[PDB]
Design a protein around this ligand. Structure first.
Ligand code: CLA
Ligand code: CLA
Ligand code: CLA
Ligand code: CLA
Ligand code: CLA
Ligand code: CLA
Ligand SMILES: CC1=C[C@H](O)CC(C)(C)[C@H]1/C=C/C(C)=C/C=C/C(C)=C/C=C/C=C(C)/C=C/C=C(C)/C=C/C1=C(C)C[C@H](O)CC1(C)C
Ligand SMILES: CC1=C[C@H](O)CC(C)(C)[C@H]1/C=C/C(C)=C/C=C/C(C)=C/C=C/C=C(C)/C=C/C=C(C)/C=C/C1=C(C)C[C@H](O)CC1(C)C
Ligand SMILES: CC1=C(/C=C/C(C)=C\C=C\C(C)=C/C=C/C=C(C)\C=C\C=C(C)\C=C\C2=C(C)C[C@@H](O)CC2(C)C)C(C)(C)CCC1
Ligand SMILES: CC1=C(/C=C/C(C)=C/C=C/C(C)=C/C=C/C=C(C)/C=C/C=C(C)/C=C/C2=C(C)CCCC2(C)C)C(C)(C)CCC1
Ligand SMILES: CC1=C(/C=C/C(C)=C\C=C\C(C)=C\C=C\C=C(C)\C=C\C=C(C)/C=C/C2=C(C)CCCC2(C)C)C(C)(C)CCC1
Ligand SMILES: CCCCCCCCCCCCO[C@@H]1O[C@H](CO)[C@@H](O[C@H]2O[C@H](CO)[C@@H](O)[C@H](O)[C@H]2O)[C@H](O)[C@H]1O
Ligand code: SF4
Ligand SMILES: [Ca+2]
Lengths: 194, 61, 41, 93, 165, 732, 80
């Protein structure tokens, strides 16, 4: 496996040992049905990859100095122009929505159409140009799934903190480091009831 | 043939007031009688009867 | 057959339709059915 | 330019193209399993109920990948409702 | 506050309801001599009324234009604004006694089951054993849960008679 | 000897008793039981019977238009709809005395007439009708439609035009056609009336059959629609200064989203009603293009139902094996239809009081009250039929081996769970809802009103605040403008929805108090109990420890004898028979709450309801007793007024209601033996012995008397209330 | 006429027979019970549907079943 979610626990037999990232965490037994287990496994990796990209982009737009993750689709409403790295991109929400649709309509359908249930989550080939898989792939898969579970949770954190703290991820961090005990989920108003 | 006299058997007959319920085998006619296992019940059916002859397959110790 | 709509009932229509429907018409229906209901097979 | 043609044409084109090369195979696969396996054959026989029986003109298209007229009037119909929802949305809302 | 419900302490109608209700008893006191039991009684009703029509307001009972105290059910509203004494707190009180009565009953039923003729201990109740099981229901919640986490509170589905489908 | 009356039932035809005549009328439209019945013939007969019902509906509508035109005050009422009273028809009673002839001359007539409470006037005005000709033309048109359907009943029953069972079992297509054509093309078609006739007529401009092909509905024309600039049709809406039927304040919009209600009419705007039908029509047509037909692209319903099985196996085989169950059972389908129609019948009443959809509808209080009560009662009877036919499905058309593990078969598995849990909720609602009414009554009697328990309906008040109600002061969603939802709609219907919802002179989200809390929970008790009765009968329709062979005994059987203690009322027909009473009790409470909440609203004494409703004594003295004062005085030893018919009906209702009791309290036996004595007397009586009965006189059947008493009981509850609801609302 | 059917669940008690008010049931010989008897319903043309026999059937459920159906002068018990 990769460890135990609750040191001491056992079982999750329905979760096979080879599954990349098996820490045994399935309390509500959502993976018992073999079919559902297949879909859930593929979806997790798909979610991880998207989540990792999002977290990096959410922090990057702020780290480099071009804005925040939330105030980015503001131009399409305020009435401005797109701006990647400052460079004004010559498009409009309408043309972007259409470009996205066809682009995702083809790539996603292509991935879904592929029926291997092992190459639908790990295609490799053109998707592995530097061929990093050679020599050992399980550890990289674990890092991919583990780093992704960190990103999926982080991406939720950014939205939650913006919803309650109403601050950008990087800015909210500084607030915590600033006065740790006085700038937490607790001292916010929405998180805790009392 | 049949559960031992006195043995409590779970009734398996669907239309039996004592279905899923247990009863003591008063006797089991060792002839070819269709339903040979006479089973007695502390509870009584709506009619008031507290016993009934069930077939060997209708009883499970 | 006057004014605009040419099918506006006459003022005596109520003094005929109401009597017929409720006294004459029903009697025919009850009697006709009575015979059918008792009709032998 | 940006007249109804721009919005209607784009919508129609995108949906038809996405339904002629992207979802077309999935569309065919879904049609099969649905009508042949779980669903059986209808219109057993008898009566002038041949109306419910499948036509034929629909099953006559040289178009590669078998893009039938119904498919062209299907994805195209979806496209003519995007061209008119995008233009209409910009009209007011 | 809450739903336009003014506090009875600030409810004018509530005050009028007092004035007019004590006047209606101070007009029935006049037609009686100062010492008669009739009059001692009507003076107690006036005192009891003047105490109740104040115990209520002091309890912060919000009342509408009618001047009649209203109750808040939402736990969040009742707790956040100190209206827990109404409905909220009373709710658990009944639940505890309710479960106490039910638990003690099942304890007795399951003891007489088995015992000789269980049907004759339901008509002629065994008051001794019935009196040894009443206090056992004091900690019913503790015992009831211990039975859920042991599969003994309910019966197996293959031992309960069911009507033909 | 054998008779011919019961052609379908030879047993009844050979019956020597009179029961053959009674049952012959009952078992008449139960073809599934008729001697020599095939599934295809059954469907063909039902299909034709449907045409017959459609002929009656159109013929019924034509008659109303005809009598409103020939004997009505439409043009006069249209001129002054807030003073003139709509006239339904004339009273030609050859028994009326002169004071009756005088008192019933009202609403502007030259003879005794009947004011209408159906509200057809307000509706026909809003849709464009202005003269009596419009009514005559419509009546003739609908009459022709009725004639066409009548011929169709004949055509579809004559060889070569009789649909095969396969056509009757063609669901995918039927649903597609009905959703796109029957529902969609009939909504866009309606938008076409509104945009072209109703809206212009409301703005004072005759666009009838004489000039419709030449009158532009919108000044710009179809140009904006073609250019995509659809907004042009939502510019220049009718101003608040607009007067219905007049160019005063008239605008130019054809489709908009203003929300709220027209100021003068106090009813939803026509343009907002035009765009509604246009929007829904588009959805219906697109939804129609879903199921598979004879072309290819499409969804096979069977596949969808079978592909929906919970992977956890909690729902067993899920909906697999259900398509045939619904397609091959005409009771399952009828039950779903009655359930759907019933529920929507209630939405019409709950959404037509709050949002008057017709001009000057709110002004007419008597119409509003008589329309709510009509639909709410009709809805209740429909719901009883839903469960009723559902129980018939369980016995007449359920295959326990095909439905094995499907969601339908795993329902009887936990039948006790469903029934018992419905018992606990009913008891909880009953013990408490009543206890807090008696408690308040005791406090009222002991002059301690402050001590009475008045729980606040905070949960409902928050749903009201969410919609924008501010009285409560919760500042939630629409109540808070700085919100997202509030800001988003601020440029659409929001500006109006609030103005209307925050006006206490109408019925949009009326202020609720602790009195409403108790009655609402009482309504829930009726909903749960009535449901429990029907559900218990449906689940135990073909099974029960007392009668394990109920399916073998059919649906309507008196009892299984005095054996096993008592089998009286054990048939699933008797769960219906009993549920009817609870249904009437439930609807009774709902239609009494409407009337009082609103009578107090209309009289201006809202505090009357806000206080008397808390205790039950207030409901009787302040509502039933106080309002009945006028109705009962329709005819007194000093004279009679126009409310005489309602007073006569009010008493008539009590008579029919009480008569129903005898058939329910008394049972078949005392009457049977009594009939035996009567038979003896007649045979012995001279001069009368000559005349004799062709059918042997017998007492009413055990099940028969149950329905006869229930019909009397129901008819009473309806006439007695209809009298009150109309004579108390009109009297003021 | 009502339909009376005797199921194999008969013990030949003859109680249903000694209970019929219109001689509709009789006891015929059989081999599936130790009483070597099984009630038959020869004359269901005289059945009134009283269901007295069922009230006299001691076997689980009911070995004798009266399905009230068509009604005649005899079935309705009419002396008119
Ligand atoms: C889930 C991943 C993701 C998503 C959805 C976005 C989305 C967005 N980013 Mg971003 N970003 C990401 C990851 C992501 N980013 C990462 C990982 C980094 C670190 C390098 C950045 C660094 C970054 C910067 C510095 C900026 C943005 C900006 C933006 C916004 C402007 C979009 C634009 O105009 O350029 C769209 C993209 C292009 C025009 C060309 C790129 C197309 C890709 C690279 C081709 C990929 C092809 C693929 C392999 C196969 C197909 C936009 C909403 C801009 C912004 O909002 O600031 C105001 C901006 O300045 N991003
Ligand atoms: C029995 C059913 C029931 C119903 C119909 C409601 C209904 C309601 N509750 Mg509630 N509640 C219930 C059970 C119920 N509750 C139970 C069993 C508990 C104990 C756990 C609570 C504890 C609770 C709290 C702590 C609060 C509510 C609150 C509310 C109101 C708004 C909160 C919301 O959006 O949804 C319902 C919310 C819950 C069921 C619990 C979650 C707590 C909510 C989400 C926090 C919202 C705070 C905020 C001030 C609410 C804004 C309301 C608006 C008018 C401004 C609302 C009318 C809020 C309130 O109005 O009090 C001031 C609130 O603070 N409830
Ligand atoms: C040990 C006694 C006992 C217990 C534990 C229960 C428990 C229960 N009953 Mg029940 N009941 C009882 C006695 C009891 N009942 C008696 C004597 C009657 C005849 C009047 C009923 C009639 C009854 C009905 C009609 C229903 C229930 C229902 C229920 C269930 C719903 C929960 C509830 O609110 O209670 C409900 C309790 C009542 C409605 C009335 C009983 C209340 C009495 C006063 C409690 C019994 C006290 C007992 C005499 C103490 C014995 C002590 C011993 C030393 C002698 C629940 C599990 C409901 C159900 O089935 O849920 C699915 C329901 O429909 N009960
Ligand atoms: C476009 C094609 C089309 C259309 C328009 C219809 C239309 C109809 N079919 Mg049909 N059918 C079709 C194709 C079609 N069918 C096909 C292809 C098949 C072969 C499978 C069938 C097989 C079939 C059968 C077997 C039956 C029908 C029946 C019916 C009628 C239903 C009865 C009714 O009154 O509904 C009317 C409902 C609406 C007009 C809309 C419903 C809206 C709800 C109910 C209320 C809306 C009220 C509104 C909000 C306010 C009103 C205010 C004021 C006007 C009062 C209906 C008129 C039944 C019938 O014959 O009845 C006579 C029936 O038995 N059809
Ligand atoms: C479109 C709706 C609809 C349709 C097509 C049917 C059709 C049918 N129903 Mg039904 N029913 C409905 C709605 C409907 N029902 C509703 C809403 C209710 C609740 C009130 C009922 C309650 C009901 C019961 C209790 C029974 C039926 C029965 C029947 C079947 C034979 C009775 C019959 O129709 O002859 C004619 C029926 C009458 C003449 C009614 C007699 C007294 C009425 C009130 C007088 C009306 C005179 C006009 C028949 C196939 C019977 C059955 O299931 O057969 C075994 C039966 O037991 N229905
Ligand atoms: C005013 C007349 C009336 C009343 C009050 C009721 C009341 C009730 N009916 Mg009912 N019904 C009626 C007429 C009435 N019915 C008629 C005319 C018919 C047609 C025959 C039906 C047919 C019918 C059916 C088919 C069913 C009901 C059911 C119910 C119960 C629903 C569950 C509930 O609310 O529990 C609430 C409990 C109460 C309101 C009782 C209050 C508590 C008592 C009064 C206090 C205890 C006693 C007190 C201390 C002192 C009194 C006794 C003392 C002298 C010793 C309920 C108690 C359903 C049922 O049985 O429930 C499972 C159901 O199946 N009814
Ligand atoms: C295990 C278990 C078992 C048992 O049985 C039960 C339970 C417990 C329940 C379970 C759990 C589960 C979980 C945890 C889940 C999670 C999920 C998530 C969170 C996801 C994310 C997810 C997330 C994600 C994807 C993300 C995404 C993102 C993206 C795309 C992008 C974004 C962006 C950026 C760049 C920036 C800009 O400016 C903007 C934008 C453009 C917008
Ligand atoms: C396929 C291929 C092939 C060839 O051959 C080779 C190569 C090229 C190498 C490959 C590629 C790969 C890739 C693409 C990768 C990616 C990665 C990533 C991006 C990750 C992220 C990842 C990401 C992540 C985890 C995230 C994380 C986050 C976290 C923790 C947290 C955060 C935050 C919060 C909440 C709030 C505060 O206030 C602040 C902070 C604290 C700041
Ligand atoms: C917070 C609270 C309320 C909130 C209620 C809400 C939001 C949800 C309520 C769910 C509720 C009340 C109940 C769900 C019950 C479901 C189950 C399966 C429990 C069944 C209980 C059982 C079987 C126990 C029975 C008992 C046993 C075995 C022994 C004895 O304990 C006696 C007995 C019969 C109790 C509101 C209404 C606002 C109001 C304010 C109190
Ligand atoms: C041959 C071929 C091809 C193709 C071509 C084309 C051009 C195609 C297209 C076709 C098309 C072109 C299709 C379409 C279809 C569509 C339809 C058939 C429908 C339409 C319309 C609509 C759907 C609308 C609707 C509506 C209205 C009416 C009103 C308003 C509202 C709405 C909009 C909704 C190519 C060249 C590539 C190459 C090879 C050969
Ligand atoms: C009578 C009456 C009624 C009833 C109604 C119904 C039930 C039905 C009707 C129906 C109708 C009476 C309808 C109408 C129709 C007409 C039309 C329909 C025409 C049109 C014309 C034109 C010229 C157009 C054409 C077209 C189309 C169609 C499509 C597209 C294209 C176009 C536009 C070209 C009521 C009760 C309400 C009341 C009052 C009286
Ligand atoms: C901001 C954007 C948010 C996401 C927007 C898109 C939502 C997700 C797509 C919805 C439409 C999916 O459309 C379709 O889904 C099915 C269901 O798995 C996929 O189907 C694919 O996986 C299933 C899994 O059982 C296979 O049986 C099938 O052979 C395969 O093609 C298709 O590849 C995809 O084209
Ligand atoms: S009294 Fe009537 S309903 Fe009851 S068991 Fe006897 S015959 Fe049947
Ligand atoms: Ca006109």
């Amino acid at each position: 496996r990769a460890g135990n979610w609750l040191p001491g626990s056992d079982a999750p037999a329905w979760l096979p040992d080879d599954l990349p990232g098996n820490y045994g965490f399935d309390p509500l037994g959502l993976c018992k049905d073999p079919a559902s287990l297949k879909r859930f496994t593929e979806s997790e990796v798909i979610h991880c990859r998207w989540a990792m990209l999002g977290a990096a982009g959410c922090l990057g737009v702020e780290a480099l100095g071009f804005g925040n993750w939330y105030d980015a689709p503001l131009w399409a409403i305020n009435g401005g122009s797109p701006t990647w790295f400052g460079i004004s991109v010559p498009f409009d929400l309408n043309t972007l929505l259409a470009v996205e649709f066809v682009a995702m309509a083809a790539a996603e359908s292509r991935r879904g159409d592929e029926t291997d249930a092992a190459k639908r989550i790990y295609p490799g080939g053109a998707f592995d140009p530097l061929n990093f898989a050679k020599g050992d792939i399980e550890t990289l898969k674990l890092k991919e799934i583990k780093n992704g579970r960190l990103a999926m949770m982080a991406c939720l954190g950014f939205v939650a903190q913006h919803a309650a703290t109403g601050k950008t991820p990087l800015q909210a961090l500084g607030d915590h480091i600033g006065n740790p005990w006085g700038s937490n989920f607790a001292t916010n108003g929405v998180s805790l009831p009392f | 043939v049949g559960p031992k006299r006195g043995s409590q058997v779970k009734i398996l007959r669907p239309e039996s007031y004592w279905y899923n319920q247990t009863g003591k085998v008063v006797s089991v006619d060792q002839s070819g009688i269709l339903y040979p296992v006479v089973v007695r019940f502390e509870t009584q059916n709506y009619a008031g009867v507290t016993t009934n002859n069930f077939a060997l397959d209708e009883v499970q110790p | 057959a006057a004014g605009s709509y040419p099918f506006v009932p006459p003022s005596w229509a109520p003094s005929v339709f109401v009597p017929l429907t409720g006294l004459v018409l029903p009697a025919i229906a009850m009697a006709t059915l009575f015979v059918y209901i008792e009709k032998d097979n | 330019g940006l007249e109804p043609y721009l919005q209607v044409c784009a919508g129609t084109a995108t949906m038809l193209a996405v339904g002629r090369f992207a979802f077309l195979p999935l569309h065919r696969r879904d049609l099969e399993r649905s009508a042949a396996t779980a669903g059986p054959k209808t219109t057993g026989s008898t009566y002038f109920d041949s109306l419910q029986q499948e036509a034929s003109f629909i099953t006559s298209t040289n178009d590669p990948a078998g893009f039938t007229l119904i498919d062209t009037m299907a994805w195209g119909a979806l496209g003519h409702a995007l061209g008119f929802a995008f233009l209409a949305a910009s009209s007011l809302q | 506050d809450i739903a336009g419900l003014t506090p009875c302490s600030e409810s004018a109608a509530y005050a009028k309801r007092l004035k007019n209700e004590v006047k209606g008893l101070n007009k029935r006191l006049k037609n009686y001599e100062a010492d008669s039991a009739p009059a001692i009684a009507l003076k107690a009703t006036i005192e009891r009324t003047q105490n109740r029509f104040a115990n209520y307001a002091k309890a912060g009972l919000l009342c509408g234009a009618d001047g009649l105290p209203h109750l808040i059910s939402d736990p969040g509203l009742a707790l956040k604004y100190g209206h827990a004494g109404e409905v909220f707190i009373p709710t658990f009180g009944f639940l505890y006694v309710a479960g106490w009565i039910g638990y003690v009953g099942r304890l007795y039923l399951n003891m007489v089951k088995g015992e000789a003729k269980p049907t004759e201990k339901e008509i002629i109740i065994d008051v001794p054993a019935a009196l040894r099981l009443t206090w056992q229901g004091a900690t019913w919640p503790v015992q009831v849960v211990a039975e859920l986490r042991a599969n003994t509170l309910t019966e197996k589905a293959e031992n309960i008679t069911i009507s033909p489908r | 000897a054998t008779k011919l009356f019961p052609k379908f039932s030879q047993g009844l035809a050979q019956d020597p008793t009179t029961r053959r005549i009674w049952f012959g009328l009952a078992v008449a439209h139960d073809f599934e039981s008729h001697d020599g019945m095939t599934e295809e013939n059954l469907y063909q007969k039902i299909f034709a019977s449907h045409f017959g019902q459609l002929a009656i509906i159109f013929l019924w509508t034509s008659g109303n238009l005809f009598h409103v035109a020939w004997q009505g005050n439409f043009e006069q009422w249209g001129a002054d709809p807030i003073h003139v009273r709509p006239i339904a028809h004339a009273i030609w009673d050859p028994h009326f005395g002169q004071p009756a002839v005088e008192a019933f001359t009202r609403g502007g007539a030259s003879g005794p007439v009947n004011i209408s409470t159906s509200g057809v006037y307000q509706w026909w005005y809003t849709i464009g009708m202005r003269t009596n000709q419009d009514l005559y033309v419509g009546s003739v048109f609908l009459a022709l439609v009725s004639a066409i359907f009548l011929f169709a009943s004949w055509l579809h029953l004559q060889p070569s035009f009789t649909p095969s069972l396969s056509w009757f079992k063609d669901a995918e297509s039927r649903l597609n056609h009905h959703l796109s054509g029957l529902f969609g093309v009939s909504s866009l078609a309606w938008t076409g009336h509104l945009v072209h006739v109703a809206i212009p007529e409301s703005r004072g401009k005759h666009v009838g059959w004489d000039n419709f092909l030449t009158q532009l509905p919108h000044p710009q024309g179809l140009t904006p629609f073609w250019t995509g600039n659809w907004a042009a049709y939502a510019q220049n809406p009718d101003s608040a200064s607009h007067v219905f039927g007049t160019s005063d304040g008239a605008g130019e919009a054809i489709l908009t989203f203003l929300g709220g209600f027209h100021p003068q009419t106090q009813s939803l705007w026509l343009t907002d009603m035009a765009h509604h039908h246009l929007a829904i029509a588009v959805i219906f047509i697109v939804a129609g293009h879903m199921y598979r037909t004879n072309f290819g692209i499409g969804h096979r319903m069977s596949a969808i139902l079978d592909a929906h099985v919970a992977p956890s196996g909690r729902l067993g085989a899920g909906h697999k094996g259900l398509f045939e169950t619904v397609n091959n059972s005409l009771h399952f389908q009828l039950g779903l239809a009655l359930a759907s129609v019933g529920t929507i019948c209630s939405l019409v009443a709950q959404h037509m009081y709050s949002l008057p959809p017709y001009a000057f509808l709110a002004n007419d209080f008597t119409t509003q009250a008589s329309l709510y009560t009509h639909h709410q009662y009709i809805a209740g009877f429909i719901m009883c039929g839903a469960f009723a036919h559902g129980a018939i499905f369980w016995i007449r058309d359920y295959d326990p081996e095909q439905n094995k593990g499907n969601v339908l078969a795993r329902m009887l598995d936990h039948k006790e769970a469903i029934i018992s849990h419905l018992s606990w909720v009913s008891l909880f609602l009953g013990f408490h809802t009543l206890g807090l009414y008696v408690h308040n009554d005791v406090m009222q009697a002991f002059g301690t009103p402050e001590k009475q328990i008045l729980i606040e309906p905070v949960f409902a008040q928050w749903i009201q605040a969410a919609h924008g109600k501010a009285f409560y002061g919760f500042d939630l969603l629409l109540s808070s403008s700085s919100s997202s939802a509030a800001s988003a709609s601020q440029t659409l219907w929001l500006p109006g929805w609030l103005d209307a919802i925050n006006n206490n002179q109408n019925s949009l989200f009326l202020t609720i108090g602790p009195g409403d809390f108790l009655v609402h929970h009482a309504i829930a008790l009726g909903l749960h109990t009535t449901t429990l009765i029907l559900v218990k009968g449906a689940l135990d329709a073909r099974g029960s420890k007392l009668m394990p062979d109920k399916k073998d005994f059919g649906y309507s059987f008196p009892c299984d004898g005095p054996g096993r203690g008592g089998t009286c009322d054990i048939s699933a027909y008797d769960a219906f028979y009993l549920a009817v009473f609870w249904m009437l009790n439930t609807i009774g409470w709902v239609t009494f709450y409407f009337h009082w909440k609103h009578l107090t609203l209309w009289q201006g004494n809202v505090s009357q309801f806000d206080e008397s409703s808390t205790y039950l004594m207030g409901w009787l003295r302040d509502y039933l007793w106080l309002n009945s004062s006028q109705l009962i005085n329709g005819y007194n030893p000093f004279g009679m007024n126009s409310l005489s018919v309602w007073a006569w009906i009010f008493l008539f209702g009590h008579l029919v209601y009480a008569t129903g009791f005898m058939f329910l309290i008394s049972w078949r036996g005392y009457w049977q033996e009594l009939i035996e004595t009567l038979v003896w007397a007649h045979e012995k009586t001279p001069l009368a012995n000559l005349v004799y009965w062709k059918d042997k006189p017998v007492a009413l059947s055990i099940v028969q008397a149950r329905l006869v008493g229930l019909t009397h009981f129901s008819v009473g509850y309806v006439f007695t209330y209809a009298a009150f609801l109309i004579a108390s609302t009109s009297g003021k | 006429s009502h339909i009376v059917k005797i199921y194999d669940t008969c013990i030949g008690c003859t109680q249903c027979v000694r209970a019929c008010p219109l001689d509709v049931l009789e006891m015929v010989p059989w081999n599936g019970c130790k009483a070597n008897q099984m009630a038959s319903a020869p004359r269901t043309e005289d059945c009134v549907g009283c269901k007295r026999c069922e009230t006299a059937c001691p076997t689980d459920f009911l070995s004798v079943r009266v399905y009230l159906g068509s009604e005649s002068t005899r079935s309705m018990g009419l002396s008119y």
